[PDB]
Amino acid sequence: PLQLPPLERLTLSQDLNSTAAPHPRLSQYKSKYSSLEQSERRRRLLELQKSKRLDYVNHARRLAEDDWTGMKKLPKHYANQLMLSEWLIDVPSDLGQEWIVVVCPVGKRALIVASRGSTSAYTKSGYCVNRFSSLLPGGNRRNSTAKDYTILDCIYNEVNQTYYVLDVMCWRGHPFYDCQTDFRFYWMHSKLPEEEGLGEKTKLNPFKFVGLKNFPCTPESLCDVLSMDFPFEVDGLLFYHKQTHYSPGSTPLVGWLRPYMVSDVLGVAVPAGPLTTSSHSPDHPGCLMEN
Amino acid sequence: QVQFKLVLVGDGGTGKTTFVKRHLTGEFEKKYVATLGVEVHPLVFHTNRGPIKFNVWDTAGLEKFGGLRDGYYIQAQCAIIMFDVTSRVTYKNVPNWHRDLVRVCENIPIVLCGNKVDIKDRKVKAKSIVFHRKKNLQYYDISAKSNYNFEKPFLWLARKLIGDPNLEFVAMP
Amino acid sequence: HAARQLLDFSQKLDINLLDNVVNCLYHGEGAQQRMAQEVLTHLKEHPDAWTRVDTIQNMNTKYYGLQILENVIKTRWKILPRNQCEGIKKYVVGLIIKTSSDPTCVEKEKVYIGKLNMILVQILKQEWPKHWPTFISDIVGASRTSESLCQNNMVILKLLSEEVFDFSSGQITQVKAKHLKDSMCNEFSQIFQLCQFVMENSQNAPLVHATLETLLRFLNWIPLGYIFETKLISTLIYKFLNVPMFRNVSLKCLTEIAGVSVSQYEEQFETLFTLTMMQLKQMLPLNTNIRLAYSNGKDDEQNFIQNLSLFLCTFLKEHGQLLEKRLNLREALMEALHYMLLVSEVEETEIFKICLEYWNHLAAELYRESPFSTSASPLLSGSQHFDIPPRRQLYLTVLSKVRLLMVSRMAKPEEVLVVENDQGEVVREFMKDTDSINLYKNMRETLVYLTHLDYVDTEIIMTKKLQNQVNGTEWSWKNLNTLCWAIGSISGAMHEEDEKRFLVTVIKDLLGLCEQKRGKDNKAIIASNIMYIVGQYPRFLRAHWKFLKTVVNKLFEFMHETHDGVQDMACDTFIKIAQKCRRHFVQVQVGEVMPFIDEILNNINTIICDLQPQQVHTFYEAVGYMIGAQTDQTVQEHLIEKYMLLPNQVWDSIIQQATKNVDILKDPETVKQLGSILKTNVRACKAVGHPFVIQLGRIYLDMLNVYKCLSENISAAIQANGEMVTKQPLIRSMRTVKRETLKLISGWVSRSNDPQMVAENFVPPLLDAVLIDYQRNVPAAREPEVLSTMAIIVNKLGGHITAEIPQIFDAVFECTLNMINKDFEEYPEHRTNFFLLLQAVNSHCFPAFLAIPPAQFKLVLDSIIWAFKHTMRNVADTGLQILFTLLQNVAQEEAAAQSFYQTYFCDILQHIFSVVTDTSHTAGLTMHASILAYMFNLVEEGKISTPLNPGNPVNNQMFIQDYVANLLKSAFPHLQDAQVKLFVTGLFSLNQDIPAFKEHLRDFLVQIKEFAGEDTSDLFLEERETALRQAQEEKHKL
């Protein structure tokens, strides 16, 4: 009989249903203090709140010019710029009409910033993982020297040396924060496949940028979705409310599930990709060069 | 801005020279090419009380390359006696270096530096370094190779020569 | 202005030389030449000296001329005509007389004076006893007639003393020095008297202070009679100790006397302590904040305190056992102990380190009086429990304050230094033996001792502190760090059962403190301390699974935290815990069905996907220790496979691409991936050990193949564009793959446990891939760690790799040698490593040296002589160790060992003296002496064949004695036959006393620097002569 301290309540954020932890069901169905079961509520007020009280124009320039003079609020450096999901718990009553889903790959979440003739990739922690040339506006030595920056939201997949583009928050020196996901996503898929070599590998563009497809969340779609092949291995599924602006930090307006959690949180087929997680010289070489 | 003459003495291989060139290039010399006599190197540090210029008199540790030894010391205003914590002999001779020095400069701030702390196999345990105590000198563990406590010997002397305990380095224009 | 002067046969001026010296001290790149030419005005002689100090910036030129005069005196004094020596002493004495008196002696710097006096001492070392008999009487008489003359004469005595008793070893020969020591002692009365006369009567402050200064250097050696059996202690304390401008010198004297062993003067020390304490209580009131007095103090008030530290600590440490037994001193000891506490709060690290030196000694002296806690309860009769040891009794209240001290000022435990390696790769290094961390260790040790004598006091002190943080609002990050640092230090100092109650309460409060505190700034600091604490007490974690589990899980989520630092914290802690709690992760605990490791493995990516590259490496090393715990080889193999599943698929993807286009291994990103994949393999290997062969064996052949690829790339590039290319991102990225591959390979063979298996399998592919490749690279492109990798593996396999040595020595030996055999500077890392490799071979593979042709051997041995010629201390050293070890390996081989002596003995002997008599190789003294000793001792019996070749009537001993004789006589022709005979005798009679052998060598190193001349004979032959045989007999006695 230990009497052992409740170290499980040790927490630094206030983020509800953090994906930084397991689903709010595996540990406590009634949960812990910074976890929920009612997403429906906050979802509604949050977008009934989108009435620009925020200078996203000025902020995009700050990320691009690494300038933070400053002469509820937006993060003041390269960390915490991405818009993160909570687990999908309160499955919406209108899910198949208002929401969308992006199949996500196994990789690294990054904040991509292209300006002043270069491109950098940051983690959620604002830790620089890469500095390189790219074909995003502002991201290579051949560009406009004048507010032509681009800020993207990507997952970097190692095997494919591709940065899969998850969202766009700023393109050609114009911010898309104030725009709905519907619009943000359409834009990606109309402009990404319209840049010269953006989606291929060359000297000025060493890392291909591919946009991630989105799909509808109707029973039919979700089925066919889980039945699909992808150019990568599947990490999970992101669900976006079509109407959400792009807010740095955690929101309920996009939720996350792992493939196997899907056909048991809503109701769909379960066959393909949803499953819970003389001596002797013996080694033979792939390359096969000189002994 | 005002300047000072800093005499840097120690045995051969101590790291004196490697130490000073790190400071004016940020580069690290793996080679051991001995100093002949002395070589005066200007170092500038930018403090919150204006710039400060040290004239490092990087003298030679090797007996045959000694030159005009105590001759160099004359009119010094601060010193940096150094040894190699991977070589006990270098610490055992510090008293000889300090002796030659204070007969010329009978009251100047002096710092004692044990270099090579980055090396794993250390021979001069921190327990043994006690010379500075009864001579009222400052001591520091340093590494020219890793920049461990790199600027310490200089911050201390500056604090002493300017007469400001809260003097700081900033690296202004 | 060329300004050169090699022209003596011309009337050579003063205005000119006086112009270069101003350059040496004043201007610039021209001054290099000036300094460079005055170094050269030291060729012929000093016929200039006389006119240089005669006809005079000014003092600086006279100073320069003094150095020259100084040299001839230390050098040729003996062979000089007596009548001329006499001119010098009179010129020097006179020159001293004049400068002193002058009303402007404070301006004509003490520098010129200090030099003159110093030259006088120089002369005295030469003939003071025998040719200057009245010296001490004269100077005393003069000091009594003139104060000005007395003030300087007091400096003449301080110098003379420290030249005979402080710095004689090395500069003076042993017998000569003892004669001067004797001489300084047979006439110290008249001296000491004068000092007393001055202290009692002279009211001249500069004269008196300097007499206290000369006294401080006399306390090093003078007969104790003058100290304890005179009123010296009495004068110092009553007269000078209190007055400002004498407090520091006076206290230092006292400190020197307190440092003596008391066996005979117990009384004097006592009245020395109590008498001093009176004066301090009058100087420094006990109620004054010493920290501030230091904080707001000058150089003299600051040093007085440091000194106070020195006095107090030195005295207690050595005579504390005496302040105790005597019951009258009990109050002065409590005041002294009260002073140490006030001085302990000074904000200076060097003072605290002195104060701490004592506390660690008190706490240690009372830990062995009794390591136990005073039986915790009272007696049934209410009487005194009596369990209190007699001495600890006297310190109880003080010990409590010292515990508070450790807990209030605990040093940071770990020292982190961020700094990028020679690749531009940015990393965090952990310092290991820094003074700062020694501070932590000491602090810990002190509190850990105190916790053993009474942990309740420790646990209460820590509870007050911790509570004063919760509510008490003594809140600040600096303080909360110090406390938990302290809590962490005493880990293991309690009984396992109190540890439980302590931990649980400590951390519950901290957990509480985290909720009440607003701000992610405050919360992370706290959560980090909690994690630090829960990390130091694996004992607890090992006995409470659910807790261990809750802690790892909490760390996993912290691994997505984005606040500065946290992710570093969570990883360090996690590897720490896995290292010490590993068996619990791989074995099924009460409450679940499968071993935790499984969860961890089934989820690696979701745990680590927000971490930086290095953190990912640290995480992988963490889980490595877990898997290393699973001793079921079937289950362990399955675990390793999945463990390496992520790094492998990257690897396996890149490899397939190169089996189509080897130019993909030139792609900046694939190379960046290759390095990180390897770094991961290196960490995993470090923790899993030998079993890791399953993974290494799987990528081994392909890995060595990319190695050759990358190595041929770098080399090409360099050959085409010079060393400059190595300083560009891709060539550094490529170096990295090579370097980590070598770490991986040498890392595993280190921890391998099947010598033949490693030798038959993983060693042959090394040859073509790494060795012939090193050979085939251009010099500027060869990887020095190829040689140190090989060294490690020869160290490991020894006998099992002896047959490959030739083939290895082919690839690398001569080719490497050619890079390091033109000077002693270029390719340092190659010199170092090459010889580390040659050592491991000579050390664990010597039969190889016999197998190869007699001429490759000579080549081998030749390089060893090359090693100990090196001015790089490390290389020269390794060079001596190889030679010394080599000679003994030869000794075992009876048959073919007599040929070695025939061919090489005399030559090795010649080469050793070569560097013995070289002023730049003094750090090898010990080994020099060891090796020669071994060789001469060998001479006296074991060299069974004839070297001279004129039969047996020329026995080897006599030959060696006559070969070394001419060796030195031909090399040092100025030495008289007697100096050289002496030396050769010493080499055989001291052949069994290494320390004495050492001093012998050094004595020779002094004589060769002097022209002792066949003329005068100061060497004390007959005396020294027998003392050698008085060592010869020690060999065949006991």
Ligand SMILES: Nc1nc2c(ncn2[C@@H]2O[C@H](COP(=O)(O)OP(=O)(O)OP(=O)(O)O)[C@@H](O)[C@H]2O)c(=O)[nH]1
């Ligand atoms: N590992 C390590 N090596 C060092 C460090 N500092 C210096 N060294 C090495 O030690 C040697 C130092 O040589 P120098 O700097 O010339 O030492 P020095 O003889 O006192 O300087 P001079 O005689 O005036 O030329 C070089 O080989 C350096 O590579 C250090 O902090 N760590």
Ligand SMILES: [Mg+2]
């Ligand atoms: Mg040198």
Ligand code: NA
């Ligand atoms: Na002196």
